[PDB]
């Protein structure tokens, strides 16, 4: 149409101009009108400077710059901003930083034209690490706040410290996870920290099993809204939760030692046919978790 011609004639004057102070005032006005998809389509290089200079102090503008790159398929450049934004000093909630690192991990998982394979994985590894930590920090804060053992005065002091940037595993372990005797989250920290120590890893597994057995036996004794599960069932849940979440690392999930422990617990605490349980529930647990048959039989031997 000639209507469509006068449209293209008009937006060529605008997009081609060399006055970038005009472009900035134009991009600022496009947002105020909610014309989001318009900013993205612009191929001028004055838009990149505007969005980059605004991403530095506005989370919701760094959002578009990341959208700008991902519609153009510059996936690495987006994860590069999403990661550098989660590590920022900006006022961003922890659960948003979990999204950022989760998107960054995806955008840095696929090849992007021009950028190396090493720099692609160099960023995916960094983002994945932080996401694992941030998930611990989130699951930790969630449990600390709901912990009756903690004073309501301290809970506010924690929430301000945790609900924001991602802290070191050292800070998460000492001043919080280990004190509260959160044995399951202590193991996730060992895994996320590549913590080399066979004993303490095993000692923590023993405490995690016992504390789990207790919470389930107290429940069964009380029944408590629905019929609670028998002890080994809740213990089995707390291992599966680690197994999927650990991705079955040999350091914090050593079948060489842990399987005897679970089999020992199944005897010393009488989780067997007496209570209607499958006597081979320790074997059934590890096999279905992905442990090789050739190894399980090697341990029972």
């Amino acid at each position: 149409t000639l209507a469509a011609t006068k449209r293209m004639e008009a937006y060529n004057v605008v997009n081609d101009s060399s006055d970038e102070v005009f472009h900035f005032d134009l991009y600022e006005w496009y947002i105020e009108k909610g014309w989001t998809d318009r900013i993205l389509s612009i191929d001028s290089p004055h838009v990149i400077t505007y969005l980059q200079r605004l991403a530095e102090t506005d989370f919701r503008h760094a959002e578009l710059l990341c959208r700008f790159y991902t519609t153009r398929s510059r996936f690495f450049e987006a994860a590069q901003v999403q990661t550098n934004l989660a590590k920022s000093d900006l006022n961003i909630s922890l659960k948003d930083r979990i999204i950022l690192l989760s998107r960054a991990k995806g955008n840095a998982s696929v090849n992007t034209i021009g950028i190396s394979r090493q720099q692609q994985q160099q960023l995916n590894h960094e983002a994945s690490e932080l996401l694992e930590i941030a998930h611990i920090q989130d699951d930790l804060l969630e449990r600390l706040v709901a912990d009756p053992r903690i004073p309501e005065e301290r809970k506010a002091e924690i929430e301000e410290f945790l609900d924001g940037p991602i802290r070191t595993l050292t800070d998460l372990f000492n001043d919080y996870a280990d004190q509260a005797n959160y044995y399951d989250l202590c193991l996730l920290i060992f895994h996320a920290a590549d913590f080399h120590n066979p004993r303490t890893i095993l000692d923590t597994w023993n405490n995690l099993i016992n504390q789990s057995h207790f919470e389930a036996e107290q429940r069964r004794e009380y029944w408590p809204i629905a019929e609670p599960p028998l002890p080994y069932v809740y213990v089995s849940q707390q291992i599966q939760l680690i197994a999927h979440r650990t991705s079955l690392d040999s350091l914090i999930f050593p079948v060489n030692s842990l399987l005897p422990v679970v089999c020992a617990y199944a005897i010393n605490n009488g989780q067997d046919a007496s209570i209607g349980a499958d006597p081979c529930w320790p074997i059934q647990l590890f096999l279905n978790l992905g442990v090789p048959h050739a190894l399980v039989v090697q341990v029972l031997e």
Binding site: I150, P151, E153, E157, T170, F173, D175, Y176, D178
Partner: peptide, 17 residues
């Protein structure tokens, strides 16, 4: 990088100041 230090912490079960 993890460093356990049971020595000096902050009592998780006591308010501040």
């Amino acid at each position: 990088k993890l460093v356990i230090n049971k020595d000096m912490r902050t009592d998780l079960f006591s308010p501040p100041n």
